[PDB]
Symmetry: C4
């Protein structure tokens, strides 16, 4: 009886309301905060075509100038940010907006990014979203970028989907909106360090 | 001498008989039951184009409202259901119907889904099947959905393929049909718990 | 000075001589024999378009009727045969013929296939080769099949490529040809068993 | 305030200056040298279309004649060179030139390639770069090759990107340029051997 998101035949019961306007779109900011027990870098992606995006896939690169231990200066090195290639979660079912998650762990290049170290670091998260417009079979690409000052430590995205009368409504007025939530200041590596300290 | 499924040249010796009618199709229900020693979520997919589906690939998302440990309400979170991305089994050779299998294990979001817990949970399995119609090079997508009341604990699919005179016949009258088979009521996690109990 | 296979600009110095004739092609048989220390199932694939095959990828399914431990009869179950999806070796650079290799190990469904057990088993290896004809952007698929009597235990493929005067020549008269080589009769599982026996 | 590589809308602020000329291009040579603590095989790839390359992906094969332990002569065997398929780093964001890296480790076929052993070995690195020209949806492939004498032990690529006034400039006069840097002569396997020697 309760309303389903997708009908047996494939039709999605989503409505798009309160309308990067009218294509694929990305939240203005990214955030870092606690989810399911882990420090997570998050941003939001949306689809306002009314074609389905077939084989939708997202990837993320961290762009940064750095110096290698050997002393070489790399003016704009690209490091991978895992956003699903490890589970298949990077192959998106994107009809309503999703919060893409990068879990910060020992393999993440943000492993030792703390709230304080962020005020000093310079980096750029580059997001790449590719898919096939079912309408024409054409492959398209959209991108965005987050600089260090567009990543908000201790913020959480508001929800944009609600249940109302036989469809799931998406409130695009809340697409970019975040709020502050209590969040440790430490990097995951520091958090890790401070446990292999205070452990019996 | 015995009849082969595929001839040396590539031609499949399948016949489609007793005919989601005339496209790609999905069983009406999914089931959960024991196969090869493991509790498995199963559903059936078919192909009634007479184009071959080139690069056919299936994925599955569990859609559910939940609350994170941090107390955030996620109105429609998407979790991955592994249906092969770990072995390449998600790249289907789909001429006759297949029973797609999700092995329920510690990584599955259904790890603690028991027959009793199912009467209370609300979830939606979303299935996405993509391929290229060889005929035109166009990429298509078909989908379906299983709600908690369309997943049948302790059911098994009937077989739809038989051998008859120089071809393998597919009986589409049995495509959706299941039957009850004796199956433990417990979740895999409970099954696991009850062994690290009663073990010398 | 010595002749290279591929020039700096991308042009391949292969010549095709002594000519599944004039498309993609597959050896008539597969073999099983020792390579680099492991029992390997091998077959040969060729490309006689004169388009390059872009994003060429091969997969292999074992088709077999079997009975599950729970006593269910599966009339035509599909098991994966790893032919590279673990290293990226399944994304082929296919200008001259290649010997595709399935290493028989504990994960292979042929793990306990011995020369004697082969005289009794019924199975069908199905091979699927997909790529994009660069010429038109169209995605094509070719297939073949090996039954149990078309898999030759203790055979080895002859080489089809030689060096001659500024190009690498492919001798298509030897494409299907194999010869017998001395090869243990035992399955890999038996080989494994017989070492955890005779071990100090 | 500081200039970003990619604008919020996706537009890249790269300029291409001092101009394999006018397509996709590859450095003339590859090098092997120390980066981030590891012996790395490196080469450079560029994109001078002014279409974006959508779903850009690179792979690398080592082509070599060798003899298997069983005594078979393989006139032109293909071994995989990992250039990212393990992290997703093989799916390139290629607007300015990148230095593609193959980390030499125990799985690399170059695991025991030393500077001295290189003067004797014969091999060919084959590079394959595929993508979709966004302009037309057509899939293209470019290739190059490095023979043993085109791989420079103890060389490092110069940087080709600099910051200048509201855009990142690419100096194509330095695209092929390398210089010598101090680098151990030993293979990684020898380096490894010489540590499990001189270890308390």
């Amino acid at each position: 009886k309760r309303q389903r998101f997708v009908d047996k035949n494939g039709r999605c019961n989503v409505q798009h309301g309160n309308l990067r306007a009218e294509t694929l779109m990305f939240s203005e900011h990214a955030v870092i905060s606690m989810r399911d027990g882990k420090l997570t870098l998050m941003f939001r992606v949306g689809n306002l075509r009314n074609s389905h995006m077939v084989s939708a896939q997202i990837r993320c690169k961290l762009l940064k100038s750095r110096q290698t231990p050997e002393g070489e200066f790399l003016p704009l090195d690209q490091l991978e940010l895992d956003v699903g290639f490890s589970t298949g979660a990077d192959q998106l079912f994107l009809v309503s907006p999703l919060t893409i998650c990068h879990v910060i762990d020992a393999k993440s290049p943000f492993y030792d990014l703390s709230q304080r170290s962020m005020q000093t670091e310079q980096f750029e998260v580059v997001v790449i979203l590719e898919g096939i417009v079912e309408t024409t079979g054409m492959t398209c690409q959209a991108r965005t970028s987050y600089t260090e000052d567009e990543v908000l430590w201790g913020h959480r995205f508001f929800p944009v989907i609600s249940l109302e009368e036989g469809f799931f409504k998406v409130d695009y007025s809340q697409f970019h909106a975040t709020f502050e939530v209590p969040t440790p200041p430490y990097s995951v590596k520091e958090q890790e360090e401070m446990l292999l300290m205070s452990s019996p």
